[PDB]
Design an enzyme around this catalytic site. Structure first.
Site, mmCIF file in Angstrom:
data_model
loop_
_atom_site.group_PDB
_atom_site.id
_atom_site.type_symbol
_atom_site.label_atom_id
_atom_site.label_comp_id
_atom_site.label_asym_id
_atom_site.label_seq_id
_atom_site.Cartn_x
_atom_site.Cartn_y
_atom_site.Cartn_z
ATOM 1 N N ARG A 123 19.370 4.232 16.771
ATOM 2 C CA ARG A 123 19.681 3.544 18.017
ATOM 3 C C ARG A 123 19.278 2.070 17.844
ATOM 4 O O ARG A 123 18.132 1.858 17.505
ATOM 5 C CB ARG A 123 18.971 4.177 19.241
ATOM 6 C CG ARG A 123 19.595 3.709 20.532
ATOM 7 C CD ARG A 123 18.825 4.077 21.804
ATOM 8 N NE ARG A 123 17.512 3.517 21.750
ATOM 9 C CZ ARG A 123 16.378 4.166 21.474
ATOM 10 N NH1 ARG A 123 16.446 5.477 21.379
ATOM 11 N NH2 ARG A 123 15.211 3.520 21.361
ATOM 12 N N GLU A 142 15.090 -4.411 18.324
ATOM 13 C CA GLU A 142 14.703 -3.606 17.200
ATOM 14 C C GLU A 142 15.819 -2.624 16.879
ATOM 15 O O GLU A 142 16.801 -2.518 17.630
ATOM 16 C CB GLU A 142 13.394 -2.801 17.293
ATOM 17 C CG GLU A 142 13.422 -1.813 18.497
ATOM 18 C CD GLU A 142 12.607 -0.571 18.169
ATOM 19 O OE1 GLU A 142 12.181 -0.365 17.014
ATOM 20 O OE2 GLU A 142 12.423 0.312 19.048
ATOM 21 N N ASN A 144 16.161 1.501 15.699
ATOM 22 C CA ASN A 144 15.292 2.717 15.585
ATOM 23 C C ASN A 144 15.939 3.700 14.629
ATOM 24 O O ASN A 144 16.996 4.233 14.973
ATOM 25 C CB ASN A 144 15.193 3.305 17.006
ATOM 26 C CG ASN A 144 14.249 2.491 17.871
ATOM 27 O OD1 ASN A 144 13.042 2.592 17.632
ATOM 28 N ND2 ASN A 144 14.747 1.748 18.841
ATOM 29 N N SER A 149 15.703 8.863 20.170
ATOM 30 C CA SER A 149 15.890 9.794 21.287
ATOM 31 C C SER A 149 16.565 9.368 22.568
ATOM 32 O O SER A 149 16.895 8.208 22.838
ATOM 33 C CB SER A 149 14.461 10.246 21.584
ATOM 34 O OG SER A 149 13.767 10.765 20.461
ATOM 35 N N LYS A 303 9.598 -3.095 11.627
ATOM 36 C CA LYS A 303 9.724 -4.399 12.272
ATOM 37 C C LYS A 303 9.657 -5.499 11.153
ATOM 38 O O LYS A 303 10.419 -6.473 11.174
ATOM 39 C CB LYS A 303 8.528 -4.578 13.238
ATOM 40 C CG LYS A 303 8.475 -3.570 14.381
ATOM 41 C CD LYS A 303 9.750 -3.323 15.158
ATOM 42 C CE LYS A 303 9.507 -2.531 16.457
ATOM 43 N NZ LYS A 303 8.931 -1.151 16.224
ATOM 44 N N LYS A 362 4.051 -7.853 16.737
ATOM 45 C CA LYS A 362 4.304 -6.447 16.462
ATOM 46 C C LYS A 362 3.803 -5.804 15.177
ATOM 47 O O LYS A 362 4.174 -6.252 14.068
ATOM 48 C CB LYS A 362 5.834 -6.304 16.433
ATOM 49 C CG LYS A 362 6.726 -6.939 17.484
ATOM 50 C CD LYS A 362 8.017 -6.124 17.688
ATOM 51 C CE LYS A 362 9.030 -6.794 18.586
ATOM 52 N NZ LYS A 362 10.362 -6.104 18.545
ATOM 53 N N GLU A 366 6.129 2.528 15.978
ATOM 54 C CA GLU A 366 7.399 2.902 16.607
ATOM 55 C C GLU A 366 7.153 3.718 17.874
ATOM 56 O O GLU A 366 6.080 4.320 18.006
ATOM 57 C CB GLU A 366 8.174 3.726 15.576
ATOM 58 C CG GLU A 366 8.976 2.925 14.553
ATOM 59 C CD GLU A 366 10.039 2.048 15.177
ATOM 60 O OE1 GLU A 366 10.466 2.461 16.299
ATOM 61 O OE2 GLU A 366 10.447 1.009 14.572
ATOM 62 N N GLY A 367 8.105 3.701 18.814
ATOM 63 C CA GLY A 367 7.906 4.543 20.001
ATOM 64 C C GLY A 367 7.230 3.926 21.178
ATOM 65 O O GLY A 367 7.026 4.640 22.156
ATOM 66 N N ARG A 448 17.905 1.493 29.093
ATOM 67 C CA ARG A 448 16.566 1.829 29.547
ATOM 68 C C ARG A 448 16.137 0.615 30.399
ATOM 69 O O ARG A 448 16.308 -0.537 29.978
ATOM 70 C CB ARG A 448 15.562 2.121 28.433
ATOM 71 C CG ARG A 448 15.913 3.337 27.590
ATOM 72 C CD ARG A 448 14.920 3.513 26.433
ATOM 73 N NE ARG A 448 15.148 2.480 25.430
ATOM 74 C CZ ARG A 448 14.321 2.085 24.466
ATOM 75 N NH1 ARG A 448 13.136 2.646 24.187
ATOM 76 N NH2 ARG A 448 14.731 1.046 23.710
#
Ligand code: ADP
Ligand code: ADP
Ligand code: GSH
Ligand code: GSH
Ligand code: MG
Ligand code: MG
Ligand code: MG
Ligand code: MG
Lengths: 472, 472
Positions: A123, A142, A144, A149, A303, A362, A366-367, A448
């Protein structure tokens, strides 16, 4: 369009929220409760906005037109070993987690890769930056590449926004919501990979922890597989160590059953790995089953790798002879700065220290929940300036999109009318057999949204909620 | 077919149950928890079987071929006032609840009926009786004419049984499950009634209590209405008393909005009515809006009316000149006995006392948990024999279907492998304008199954679970 106007009347809000929540649960937009992450005996709605956030149609089109380019890019990175070692050379001396991931990639390179089928389910996330003219420009936040998800739940929420608008007799607007079905597309990629592995009775192995609130979003992919007669077994890394084994041809076997694809839903953060989980991940990467993502592709999602790719000539060297692709990709890059020892790193640090609301710091995580901003970023930078540790991070230009009012619904908290900003994600799917790209596609999107006071984000991390892009 | 064979291996059971439950929640087969019946902040799966119970295709066809006849029958009963008074004359002197329902029917008859549009949404329930040959015969257990539920959830469970069979690679069997969509059909009836009322901006009023675990099943009808741009407002009887009013033409208004149809989801048991709720029900029945069911149609659903209709010549007098209809209906009747003062009542009581496992004793109630069997029935009969109170009940031949093993899943309890028996329901829908039947149809089915030790039943009452008929 304007949602703010529908959010000022309180009795009506309470009623539209009641409507939305019930339709969301009926459509399957669920998460297990936080108090019982291992039980489906009780569940709730995943957080979501009351209305779909307005999104410039041109930017949404642009995000879609570059996904195939990003899938190519991530796949070139994962195959170029020199690029990854040089890129991560400094990170790995300072970051244990990137060192372990990298060390598995090395042992695997050393033994030779057993797998002959490769695939990525990812994603790519963007924000909308206010530009010179005023035109918002699509900028990448970023990419992913491991456990990408919310594609299952995202196929279920549109019906929810149509419903809310229908209740208010806005059939026109309800009609403009885009239908979206990413889990079908994500599933088709694992399906392709299973097909190519070529064993009729081999299973797809889904790696997930026992405490998993987001099981329904994973089940959605499993449902699409199951409809094509491909079976999935869910197991933890601990299960792999106790019961996974390799045959002579390095075939992966679990409980005596042959695994064709290893779909990771866990393992993107250090807290998910004990010493034995690290051996189980190495064991899976050493195997002949297609891995989703394989360890190098997971390293391509760091990153630091993202920052390196923005340097002039870097895109060109990874995708040689592909100038239009190069251009579409580069248009999405915002400012990215190495913090390695050296003059460039010293300069980025001075800029961040001079105008801290404009950058984000950063780590290679992740997440959600790991980046540093404003006050914490400043304090960290003042200690990192003179440390070798600085190489574990990168610095990035903060995008600051124009805020818009929406209403957020999260279980256990009252409906909250607030200023919000969104992040648009495009799911990518590609599969390759040896060196021939056999499938390369975009499969859907994910919007999101979060309340303006949150510097950071992520749905599973508790900040952002599920939304849908209302094309304007 | 045989499920018993798949239920003996425990690790596999635990796994198929896990599979079923997650797919059931994703498909919207939900109920609010019992601990918070007013909140959708947390929910669970409605109870259901792991596999679809085998059902003789001929009986399922037979149940479907008689629904249109039962809709005609219930509608003739509700319009024949002399039949209802004579039938219920004795019940109403002994049963306060049937007296109040009947008294509203009388006041309404007296003032003249305001409504000109009539409709019934019902469910006719049958069991499979072992007969002479051995052939199971379709026998009616009861007819439900008020708040006929579970039609929304039943549209959602087939996908759940297909899933369970798919997991086991029984794609053949998965393929035989019947798709079913009763809420669409139930909604179409309220839609027709709204159309005919003829006010573009009038709402459908859904009468439901605040504590309602089964809200999702009701929302399903609301979703189908909303898709045709018909809006529903949910309110309790208490809300009606505080805010319902009639205009000059007896139009019902709620909060200033005009009501076209009153869809009852509450009011089939005495505990649901305080003195003011009784005035609100009278207020709604006095109005010009179509009622679902209207008070007479609710009286047509009493067990006493069911018993009376089995007497020779009774079907004939209600549906004169319709002998094939009469026959289809009569084939479904099992033994039904008046317990009024008199020789017939004395005889039925003696038979029940001589062989108590073969009869059931029923009060004029609805929704499960009220009939009496075996020991309690015997004890009650010994006190009722010499009382006027005997007239509040009826006695009926117990059907005792052959038990078959299945597995029941209910939230909070372990999967339970047990002998079970099923009850097949067929949903009926009819609408009439004045005296012209404008819609008359069957719209889907509902198979409810329960563990063999339960004499009584019902899903909302906590005994039976949702199931699907596997045609054999
Ligand atoms: N450059 C940026 N501009 C604006 N917000 C950012 C920026 N970088 C990170 N964020 C915020 O923090 C969140 C998490 O950062 P991200 O780079 O996506 O890492 P993770 O892999 O932890 O999601 C984003 O979804 C966004 O809310
Ligand atoms: N005649 C009967 N034979 C078998 N079971 C019966 C019989 N009558 C009632 N029952 C059982 O009790 C349940 C409830 O009775 P029912 O007549 O349907 O009244 P309610 O309106 O309370 O559902 C049925 O679903 C069935 O389990
Ligand atoms: N356990 C979860 C969470 C994994 C996760 O958070 N994945 C990240 C990539 S590392 C992402 O897609 N999260 C999106 C969201 O949280 O907004 C899973 O498989 O669903
Ligand atoms: N509050 C519920 C329960 C009403 C009810 O139990 N309805 C009965 C008719 S009185 C029935 O259909 N119940 C079926 C079930 O419980 O099995 C509603 O509207 O859903
Ligand atoms: Mg992110
Ligand atoms: Mg990320
Ligand atoms: Mg019943
Ligand atoms: Mg009943």
């Amino acid at each position: 369009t304007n949602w703010g106007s529908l959010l000022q009347d309180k009795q009506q809000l309470e009623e539209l929220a009641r409507q939305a929540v019930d339709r969301a649960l009926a459509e399957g937009v669920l998460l297990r409760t936080s108090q019982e992450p291992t039980s489906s005996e009780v569940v709730s709605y995943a957080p979501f906005t009351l209305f779909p956030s307005l999104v410039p149609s041109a930017l949404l089109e642009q995000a879609y037109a570059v996904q195939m380019d990003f899938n190519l890019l991530v796949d070139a990175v994962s195959q170029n070993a020199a690029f990854l070692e040089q890129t991560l050379s400094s990170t790995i001396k300072q970051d244990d987690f990137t060192a372990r991931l990298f060390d598995i990639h090395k042992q695997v390179l050393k033994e030779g890769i057993a797998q002959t089928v490769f695939l990525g389910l990812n994603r790519s996330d963007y924000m909308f930056q206010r530009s010179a003219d005023g035109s918002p420009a699509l900028k990448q936040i970023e990419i992913n590449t491991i456990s990408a998800s919310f594609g299952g739940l995202a196929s279920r929420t549109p019906a929810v926004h149509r419903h809310v608008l229908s209740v208010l007799s806005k059939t026109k607007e309800a009609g403009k919501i885009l239908s979206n079905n990413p889990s079908k597309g994500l599933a088709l990629g694992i399906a392709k990979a299973w097909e190519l592995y070529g064993s009729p009775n081999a299973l797809v192995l889904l790696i997930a922890q026992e405490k998993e609130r987001n099981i329904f979003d994973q089940r959605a992919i499993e449902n699409e597989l199951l409809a094509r007669n491909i079976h999935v077994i869910r197991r933890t890394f601990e299960d792999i160590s106790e019961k996974g084994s390799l045959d002579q041809d390095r075939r992966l076997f679990v409980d005596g059953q042959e695994i064709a694809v290893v779909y990771f839903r866990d393992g993107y953060m250090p807290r998910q790995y004990s010493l034995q989980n690290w051996e189980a991940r190495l064991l899976l990467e050493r195997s002949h089953a297609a891995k989703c993502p394989d360890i190098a592709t997971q390293l391509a999602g760091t990153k630091k790798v993202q920052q390196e790719l923005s340097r002039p000539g870097m895109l060109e060297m990874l995708l040689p002879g592909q100038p239009e692709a190069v251009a579409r990709l580069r248009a999405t890059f915002a400012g990215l700065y190495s913090l390695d020892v050296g003059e460039e790193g010293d300069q980025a640090i001075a800029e961040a220290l001079a105008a801290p609301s404009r950058f984000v710091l950063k780590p290679q995580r992740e997440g959600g929940g790991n980046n540093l901003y404003g006050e914490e970023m400043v304090q960290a930078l003042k200690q990192l300036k003179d440390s070798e540790e600085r190489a574990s991070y990168i610095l990035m230009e903060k995008i600051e999109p124009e805020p818009f009012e929406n209403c957020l619904l999260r279980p256990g908290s009252p409906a909250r009318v607030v200023q919000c900003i969104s992040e648009l994600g495009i799911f990518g799917v590609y599969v390759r057999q040896e060196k021939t790209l056999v499938m390369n596609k975009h499969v859907g999107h994910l919007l999101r949204t979060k309340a303006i006071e949150h510097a950071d984000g992520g749905v599973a991390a508790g900040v952002a909620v599920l939304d849908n892009p209302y094309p304007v």
